[PDB]
């Protein structure tokens, strides 16, 4: 509620709060403000704009790029005190403050009301960045994107005069700020203003005003499988057969009407140095033939592969399953990572598979931790028209995430080069990047990668903005001109109006 | 604050909420109430008391025993809505609600005020059970037990007539409820009443009433080391030298005035099947000669061992370090675990060491996941007289935690036997248990183990109650007679009045 002292170099908290969770980026802000309300954010924004000081907001700190911690940022607004999660009877919707972590969101919504939101897997990700970016995760095939439930958004914006004010923008089409609401359904963090809180509830018409009916219900229990194929004895033809099995399966079973909307999985194509390839799968356990359906899927992936996978399955209550590291991730954010990603509308072709194999088995590189992970997608995501939100990829079947991780900062160039070359080579037919509307559908802004705007790495002539946003981009630039005319909110991949 | 519907079988949340985080114990409650106030706790209690229904409280769900999920328990009070952490200005103390997790506690106190509490490592542990039981963790050597900061407690109690009421008990010796407060400094959960919230504050008399000065400050940054010895290059002689070096060092360097109170480590004596023996160490990074002080410790542990360990050190800001899985644990609460523990006043003698070796190297057992962990302890913990709190062990150098983990419920007897026989054999000279006042100082009630009350496994003639509480037990019994005369709050290891 009340304002408190900001954090400056010298403070015991400075080394923590000058960073997000991505340790590659160490900020030099002069002041970090632990804001407590919309009114305080307005005060912080006005003084900063009067004095010419560059601002950035930190919510959960999960940014894969240096949007918040880059050296030009002088004033951070840290949303840590604004972490409430609750049901706002005033609006008939669930309020999620920007500083709320996904783990607090899922615990509170489910323990208290028996509902959930289909966002990310990672418990520590913050609502602030995640929802704005088009968050998704294990329940997306079943329930769509988290932005599919965005009813309203409270956001502190800066007018042309440099005054800051707070506005509510709603899903109501007659709402005078409806455009700014739209831009929060995937327009991405750091662009338009400071989100204070989001309100979430089903669009559905025919619903009693009871919180327990206003958001999706998760499956009560799920089956959770780990499958591991050892690399020693996995030849190129074995690798390729497993990839192509998996792609075909997702090609045929990711429609919005598929009975497989209740499955989610991540196939990890690891460096052969790791000694094993792995897959994690989750299926709704509450229907009749659940055990069998899981086995059918696993059988499809390993069909004719010629390597016997070690397989184990456990069954867990839903909220418990969310924190199993097989789905949540291993919680270690203390290394250095570089992430790239793409939408896939169809699975890898024979050429891309060959590149994958070469690159993952290569002895030119030394790092067991590089991975290309194929994340189950589509399903109910794809029920939504591509222009209804600012998430324009509504017919994809997988997200593909290329990652490499290491320790020593002296080694940055070597790991960064490995991953740029792998990604370029996989997307070689199309300028080194996943051009929208073909085999791929561009890229996902919650996995930002500044190389998509680098002309050395992107040779497709398709700019970064179209990779992320497709035809959403002109409408996001209209919102930008309207609500952030001074371009107060910006970073290496921020929405920007046309040249004057 | 409003009451909401209780959770009953058939509810989507029942499979999650009938459990804690220990999956070995599955409750059969008839109703789980998500209480939101003292007032609502009173109603729920006094209606159970009128019906004769057995109650239990759930906060963090981390109980290592079946105290909450025992099949006799009929009505659970789940504290999840009572999760606030903040500074209570009127009382001049930090208020932590019983449902708050230790990660929310550390994030709030540190980011907002730059202070902390020396409680547990694990971020998902609940305040409710942890503080009551005598919580400690990586900063205990520096700052004592979390109970050394308990200033007041708000607890709902049941009187002889069966009426529920809420009382506030403080650290002021003339408080009529002072002994109730005292029982909450280590008495253990599930014994006296329902804790709504704790109030925490330094005992120092100097201190100006400002929140940033009323709890201890953590070190701004720490060094964190992971040292690993491969099992394949370890003979019994090497093993024993290692354990002896470690024990001697802890013997010499754990007094309340030691320069080494800023060091914490965990030595993991793992089954040799695991391929590696490991030690995680944390040291304050901020004072002169930090790196070299760390080095002289790691060198002391390895001295004359004849096996060079893999040793890497990272430096991290303090709040970030709390979430590194090396200190925090790996977050996986699925599967099945049995935990035993002991206080250590001196390190293992030669015969105990040979026992450890035999049992960790045995091929009569098949489990890589068995470990004996030696956790740094003492330091400022040991500046408090043994009788000032219900934590009676105030001269120990180490906690020793014995663990085995597995998957299949049909193997329960085998793993339970293994860990039972290990612990008995280590404590063979004292009836198979760590009898207080000698080489050991009993056991720690936050690591409960019902076997300590089992004549088949405890043949020492020292009862369970004396192992946990030493000469604190009579004062704890008086508190039980005075505040829980009906014995509403009970479990397999609950404080019990003398037979009449
Ligand atoms: C590290 C990490 C990221 C994950 C993980 N799992 C995900 C998943 O299963 N599904 C996903 O869709 N995404 C996953 N992600 C990625 C996260 O979704 C993105 O990393 C989010 O953008 C992160 O959000 P947040 O934690 O809030 O990150 P910040 O660095 O604070 O902000 C990112 C970006 O957004 C701007 N921004 C923050 N807060 C605000 C507010 N209130 N208003 C406007 N703009 C805001 C920031 O300035 C920054 O530009 C799993 C893991 C382990
Ligand atoms: C699983 C787990 C436990 C840990 C971990 N790390 C620890 C550490 O680093 N240091 C420690 O000292 N302890 C560690 N522990 C153990 C925890 O301290 C104990 O397991 C705590 O007892 C757990 O507390 P909580 O999470 O609240 O567990 P519950 O199961 O809800 O309760 C335990 C016990 O206490 C009673 N009780 C709960 N809440 C109340 C209230 N409000 N009032 C009275 N009594 C209460 C319960 O009924 C039950 O009897 C690391 C990990 C991973
Ligand atoms: C399923 C997930 C969805 C989320 O979108 C993110 O979360 C999950 C669990 O996995 C995704 C991906 C496969 C794994 C990554 C990036 C690994 C990251 C990693 O090891 C590290 C870091 O990021 C920093 N230090 C590190 O060591 C990632 C994009
Ligand atoms: C330093 C710690 C202090 C805490 O007091 C607890 O945390 C820390 C990190 O370590 C302690 C101990 C070594 C480890 C244990 C019990 C492992 C548990 C474990 O693997 C499992 C479970 O408990 C359930 N499933 C599982 O797989 C434990 C008691
Ligand atoms: Cl949808
Ligand atoms: Cl209350
Ligand atoms: Cl935890
Ligand atoms: Cl947990
Ligand atoms: Cl008893
Ligand atoms: Mg958990
Ligand atoms: Mg990693
Ligand atoms: Mg974290
Ligand atoms: Mg484990």
mmCIF file with all atom_site columns, N, CA, C and O in Angstrom, chain A residues 24 334-339 365-367 369 403-417 419, chain B residues 314:
data_model
loop_
_atom_site.group_PDB
_atom_site.id
_atom_site.type_symbol
_atom_site.label_atom_id
_atom_site.label_alt_id
_atom_site.label_comp_id
_atom_site.label_asym_id
_atom_site.label_entity_id
_atom_site.label_seq_id
_atom_site.pdbx_PDB_ins_code
_atom_site.Cartn_x
_atom_site.Cartn_y
_atom_site.Cartn_z
_atom_site.occupancy
_atom_site.B_iso_or_equiv
_atom_site.pdbx_formal_charge
_atom_site.auth_seq_id
_atom_site.auth_comp_id
_atom_site.auth_asym_id
_atom_site.auth_atom_id
_atom_site.pdbx_PDB_model_num
ATOM 1   N N  . UNK A 1 24  ? 23.016 -13.745 -17.015 1.00 0.00 ? 24  UNK A N  1
ATOM 2   C CA . UNK A 1 24  ? 23.819 -13.095 -18.051 1.00 0.00 ? 24  UNK A CA 1
ATOM 3   C C  . UNK A 1 24  ? 23.685 -11.589 -17.993 1.00 0.00 ? 24  UNK A C  1
ATOM 4   O O  . UNK A 1 24  ? 24.597 -10.894 -18.387 1.00 0.00 ? 24  UNK A O  1
ATOM 5   N N  . UNK A 1 334 ? 20.857 -20.670 -12.112 1.00 0.00 ? 334 UNK A N  1
ATOM 6   C CA . UNK A 1 334 ? 22.170 -20.097 -11.728 1.00 0.00 ? 334 UNK A CA 1
ATOM 7   C C  . UNK A 1 334 ? 23.283 -20.279 -12.752 1.00 0.00 ? 334 UNK A C  1
ATOM 8   O O  . UNK A 1 334 ? 24.476 -20.027 -12.469 1.00 0.00 ? 334 UNK A O  1
ATOM 9   N N  . UNK A 1 335 ? 22.904 -20.755 -13.925 1.00 0.00 ? 335 UNK A N  1
ATOM 10  C CA . UNK A 1 335 ? 23.861 -20.905 -14.983 1.00 0.00 ? 335 UNK A CA 1
ATOM 11  C C  . UNK A 1 335 ? 23.688 -19.737 -15.928 1.00 0.00 ? 335 UNK A C  1
ATOM 12  O O  . UNK A 1 335 ? 23.095 -18.703 -15.585 1.00 0.00 ? 335 UNK A O  1
ATOM 13  N N  . UNK A 1 336 ? 24.242 -19.913 -17.108 1.00 0.00 ? 336 UNK A N  1
ATOM 14  C CA . UNK A 1 336 ? 24.098 -18.970 -18.253 1.00 0.00 ? 336 UNK A CA 1
ATOM 15  C C  . UNK A 1 336 ? 23.384 -19.758 -19.332 1.00 0.00 ? 336 UNK A C  1
ATOM 16  O O  . UNK A 1 336 ? 23.764 -20.911 -19.619 1.00 0.00 ? 336 UNK A O  1
ATOM 17  N N  . UNK A 1 337 ? 22.319 -19.190 -19.873 1.00 0.00 ? 337 UNK A N  1
ATOM 18  C CA . UNK A 1 337 ? 21.586 -19.856 -20.933 1.00 0.00 ? 337 UNK A CA 1
ATOM 19  C C  . UNK A 1 337 ? 21.344 -18.926 -22.148 1.00 0.00 ? 337 UNK A C  1
ATOM 20  O O  . UNK A 1 337 ? 21.179 -17.711 -21.992 1.00 0.00 ? 337 UNK A O  1
ATOM 21  N N  . UNK A 1 338 ? 21.274 -19.528 -23.338 1.00 0.00 ? 338 UNK A N  1
ATOM 22  C CA . UNK A 1 338 ? 20.782 -18.828 -24.501 1.00 0.00 ? 338 UNK A CA 1
ATOM 23  C C  . UNK A 1 338 ? 19.649 -19.633 -25.141 1.00 0.00 ? 338 UNK A C  1
ATOM 24  O O  . UNK A 1 338 ? 19.802 -20.841 -25.453 1.00 0.00 ? 338 UNK A O  1
ATOM 25  N N  . UNK A 1 339 ? 18.522 -18.958 -25.348 1.00 0.00 ? 339 UNK A N  1
ATOM 26  C CA . UNK A 1 339 ? 17.310 -19.600 -25.859 1.00 0.00 ? 339 UNK A CA 1
ATOM 27  C C  . UNK A 1 339 ? 16.955 -19.021 -27.222 1.00 0.00 ? 339 UNK A C  1
ATOM 28  O O  . UNK A 1 339 ? 17.082 -17.803 -27.406 1.00 0.00 ? 339 UNK A O  1
ATOM 29  N N  . UNK A 1 365 ? 31.987 -29.474 -30.861 1.00 0.00 ? 365 UNK A N  1
ATOM 30  C CA . UNK A 1 365 ? 31.422 -28.775 -29.729 1.00 0.00 ? 365 UNK A CA 1
ATOM 31  C C  . UNK A 1 365 ? 31.559 -29.675 -28.490 1.00 0.00 ? 365 UNK A C  1
ATOM 32  O O  . UNK A 1 365 ? 31.435 -30.913 -28.566 1.00 0.00 ? 365 UNK A O  1
ATOM 33  N N  . UNK A 1 366 ? 31.807 -29.040 -27.352 1.00 0.00 ? 366 UNK A N  1
ATOM 34  C CA . UNK A 1 366 ? 31.870 -29.739 -26.084 1.00 0.00 ? 366 UNK A CA 1
ATOM 35  C C  . UNK A 1 366 ? 30.942 -29.123 -25.052 1.00 0.00 ? 366 UNK A C  1
ATOM 36  O O  . UNK A 1 366 ? 31.276 -28.130 -24.405 1.00 0.00 ? 366 UNK A O  1
ATOM 37  N N  . UNK A 1 367 ? 29.772 -29.721 -24.919 1.00 0.00 ? 367 UNK A N  1
ATOM 38  C CA . UNK A 1 367 ? 28.764 -29.301 -23.964 1.00 0.00 ? 367 UNK A CA 1
ATOM 39  C C  . UNK A 1 367 ? 27.637 -30.313 -23.979 1.00 0.00 ? 367 UNK A C  1
ATOM 40  O O  . UNK A 1 367 ? 26.909 -30.356 -24.969 1.00 0.00 ? 367 UNK A O  1
ATOM 41  N N  . UNK A 1 369 ? 24.910 -30.100 -22.398 1.00 0.00 ? 369 UNK A N  1
ATOM 42  C CA . UNK A 1 369 ? 23.655 -29.417 -22.075 1.00 0.00 ? 369 UNK A CA 1
ATOM 43  C C  . UNK A 1 369 ? 22.874 -28.705 -23.236 1.00 0.00 ? 369 UNK A C  1
ATOM 44  O O  . UNK A 1 369 ? 21.836 -28.107 -22.950 1.00 0.00 ? 369 UNK A O  1
ATOM 45  N N  . UNK A 1 403 ? 18.159 -24.559 -26.925 1.00 0.00 ? 403 UNK A N  1
ATOM 46  C CA . UNK A 1 403 ? 18.811 -24.021 -25.777 1.00 0.00 ? 403 UNK A CA 1
ATOM 47  C C  . UNK A 1 403 ? 20.184 -24.628 -25.586 1.00 0.00 ? 403 UNK A C  1
ATOM 48  O O  . UNK A 1 403 ? 20.445 -25.763 -25.954 1.00 0.00 ? 403 UNK A O  1
ATOM 49  N N  . UNK A 1 404 ? 21.083 -23.787 -25.096 1.00 0.00 ? 404 UNK A N  1
ATOM 50  C CA . UNK A 1 404 ? 22.333 -24.252 -24.639 1.00 0.00 ? 404 UNK A CA 1
ATOM 51  C C  . UNK A 1 404 ? 22.609 -23.539 -23.333 1.00 0.00 ? 404 UNK A C  1
ATOM 52  O O  . UNK A 1 404 ? 22.210 -22.394 -23.172 1.00 0.00 ? 404 UNK A O  1
ATOM 53  N N  . UNK A 1 405 ? 23.298 -24.227 -22.422 1.00 0.00 ? 405 UNK A N  1
ATOM 54  C CA . UNK A 1 405 ? 23.528 -23.723 -21.078 1.00 0.00 ? 405 UNK A CA 1
ATOM 55  C C  . UNK A 1 405 ? 24.979 -24.028 -20.680 1.00 0.00 ? 405 UNK A C  1
ATOM 56  O O  . UNK A 1 405 ? 25.534 -25.060 -21.101 1.00 0.00 ? 405 UNK A O  1
ATOM 57  N N  . UNK A 1 406 ? 25.592 -23.136 -19.891 1.00 0.00 ? 406 UNK A N  1
ATOM 58  C CA . UNK A 1 406 ? 27.020 -23.255 -19.492 1.00 0.00 ? 406 UNK A CA 1
ATOM 59  C C  . UNK A 1 406 ? 27.264 -22.484 -18.199 1.00 0.00 ? 406 UNK A C  1
ATOM 60  O O  . UNK A 1 406 ? 26.293 -21.992 -17.572 1.00 0.00 ? 406 UNK A O  1
ATOM 61  N N  . UNK A 1 407 ? 28.521 -22.366 -17.771 1.00 0.00 ? 407 UNK A N  1
ATOM 62  C CA . UNK A 1 407 ? 28.834 -21.671 -16.512 1.00 0.00 ? 407 UNK A CA 1
ATOM 63  C C  . UNK A 1 407 ? 29.695 -20.435 -16.699 1.00 0.00 ? 407 UNK A C  1
ATOM 64  O O  . UNK A 1 407 ? 29.393 -19.358 -16.168 1.00 0.00 ? 407 UNK A O  1
ATOM 65  N N  . UNK A 1 408 ? 30.783 -20.607 -17.427 1.00 0.00 ? 408 UNK A N  1
ATOM 66  C CA . UNK A 1 408 ? 31.866 -19.618 -17.470 1.00 0.00 ? 408 UNK A CA 1
ATOM 67  C C  . UNK A 1 408 ? 31.539 -18.506 -18.479 1.00 0.00 ? 408 UNK A C  1
ATOM 68  O O  . UNK A 1 408 ? 31.372 -18.784 -19.671 1.00 0.00 ? 408 UNK A O  1
ATOM 69  N N  . UNK A 1 409 ? 31.429 -17.254 -18.006 1.00 0.00 ? 409 UNK A N  1
ATOM 70  C CA . UNK A 1 409 ? 31.143 -16.153 -18.919 1.00 0.00 ? 409 UNK A CA 1
ATOM 71  C C  . UNK A 1 409 ? 32.207 -15.982 -19.990 1.00 0.00 ? 409 UNK A C  1
ATOM 72  O O  . UNK A 1 409 ? 31.878 -15.496 -21.080 1.00 0.00 ? 409 UNK A O  1
ATOM 73  N N  . UNK A 1 410 ? 33.447 -16.400 -19.710 1.00 0.00 ? 410 UNK A N  1
ATOM 74  C CA . UNK A 1 410 ? 34.488 -16.309 -20.702 1.00 0.00 ? 410 UNK A CA 1
ATOM 75  C C  . UNK A 1 410 ? 34.096 -17.151 -21.919 1.00 0.00 ? 410 UNK A C  1
ATOM 76  O O  . UNK A 1 410 ? 34.574 -16.889 -23.025 1.00 0.00 ? 410 UNK A O  1
ATOM 77  N N  . UNK A 1 411 ? 33.198 -18.123 -21.732 1.00 0.00 ? 411 UNK A N  1
ATOM 78  C CA . UNK A 1 411 ? 32.845 -19.031 -22.813 1.00 0.00 ? 411 UNK A CA 1
ATOM 79  C C  . UNK A 1 411 ? 31.602 -18.578 -23.583 1.00 0.00 ? 411 UNK A C  1
ATOM 80  O O  . UNK A 1 411 ? 31.211 -19.233 -24.557 1.00 0.00 ? 411 UNK A O  1
ATOM 81  N N  . UNK A 1 412 ? 30.972 -17.467 -23.188 1.00 0.00 ? 412 UNK A N  1
ATOM 82  C CA . UNK A 1 412 ? 29.795 -16.975 -23.972 1.00 0.00 ? 412 UNK A CA 1
ATOM 83  C C  . UNK A 1 412 ? 29.890 -17.109 -25.527 1.00 0.00 ? 412 UNK A C  1
ATOM 84  O O  . UNK A 1 412 ? 28.968 -17.642 -26.146 1.00 0.00 ? 412 UNK A O  1
ATOM 85  N N  . UNK A 1 413 ? 30.969 -16.589 -26.167 1.00 0.00 ? 413 UNK A N  1
ATOM 86  C CA . UNK A 1 413 ? 30.949 -16.603 -27.642 1.00 0.00 ? 413 UNK A CA 1
ATOM 87  C C  . UNK A 1 413 ? 30.827 -17.985 -28.248 1.00 0.00 ? 413 UNK A C  1
ATOM 88  O O  . UNK A 1 413 ? 30.113 -18.176 -29.237 1.00 0.00 ? 413 UNK A O  1
ATOM 89  N N  . UNK A 1 414 ? 31.572 -18.940 -27.714 1.00 0.00 ? 414 UNK A N  1
ATOM 90  C CA . UNK A 1 414 ? 31.522 -20.303 -28.209 1.00 0.00 ? 414 UNK A CA 1
ATOM 91  C C  . UNK A 1 414 ? 30.105 -20.937 -28.073 1.00 0.00 ? 414 UNK A C  1
ATOM 92  O O  . UNK A 1 414 ? 29.657 -21.583 -29.004 1.00 0.00 ? 414 UNK A O  1
ATOM 93  N N  . UNK A 1 415 ? 29.404 -20.781 -26.939 1.00 0.00 ? 415 UNK A N  1
ATOM 94  C CA . UNK A 1 415 ? 28.057 -21.395 -26.794 1.00 0.00 ? 415 UNK A CA 1
ATOM 95  C C  . UNK A 1 415 ? 26.993 -20.660 -27.613 1.00 0.00 ? 415 UNK A C  1
ATOM 96  O O  . UNK A 1 415 ? 26.092 -21.284 -28.164 1.00 0.00 ? 415 UNK A O  1
ATOM 97  N N  . UNK A 1 416 ? 27.074 -19.327 -27.616 1.00 0.00 ? 416 UNK A N  1
ATOM 98  C CA . UNK A 1 416 ? 26.235 -18.467 -28.445 1.00 0.00 ? 416 UNK A CA 1
ATOM 99  C C  . UNK A 1 416 ? 26.383 -18.789 -29.952 1.00 0.00 ? 416 UNK A C  1
ATOM 100 O O  . UNK A 1 416 ? 25.398 -18.865 -30.682 1.00 0.00 ? 416 UNK A O  1
ATOM 101 N N  . UNK A 1 417 ? 27.604 -19.024 -30.395 1.00 0.00 ? 417 UNK A N  1
ATOM 102 C CA . UNK A 1 417 ? 27.868 -19.370 -31.810 1.00 0.00 ? 417 UNK A CA 1
ATOM 103 C C  . UNK A 1 417 ? 27.307 -20.766 -32.107 1.00 0.00 ? 417 UNK A C  1
ATOM 104 O O  . UNK A 1 417 ? 26.705 -21.000 -33.174 1.00 0.00 ? 417 UNK A O  1
ATOM 105 N N  . UNK A 1 419 ? 24.730 -22.164 -30.851 1.00 0.00 ? 419 UNK A N  1
ATOM 106 C CA . UNK A 1 419 ? 23.289 -22.179 -30.953 1.00 0.00 ? 419 UNK A CA 1
ATOM 107 C C  . UNK A 1 419 ? 22.789 -21.322 -32.159 1.00 0.00 ? 419 UNK A C  1
ATOM 108 O O  . UNK A 1 419 ? 21.831 -21.724 -32.800 1.00 0.00 ? 419 UNK A O  1
ATOM 109 N N  . UNK B 2 314 ? 30.772 -20.865 -7.151  1.00 0.00 ? 314 UNK B N  1
ATOM 110 C CA . UNK B 2 314 ? 30.073 -19.749 -7.776  1.00 0.00 ? 314 UNK B CA 1
ATOM 111 C C  . UNK B 2 314 ? 29.809 -18.732 -6.665  1.00 0.00 ? 314 UNK B C  1
ATOM 112 O O  . UNK B 2 314 ? 29.731 -19.092 -5.469  1.00 0.00 ? 314 UNK B O  1
#
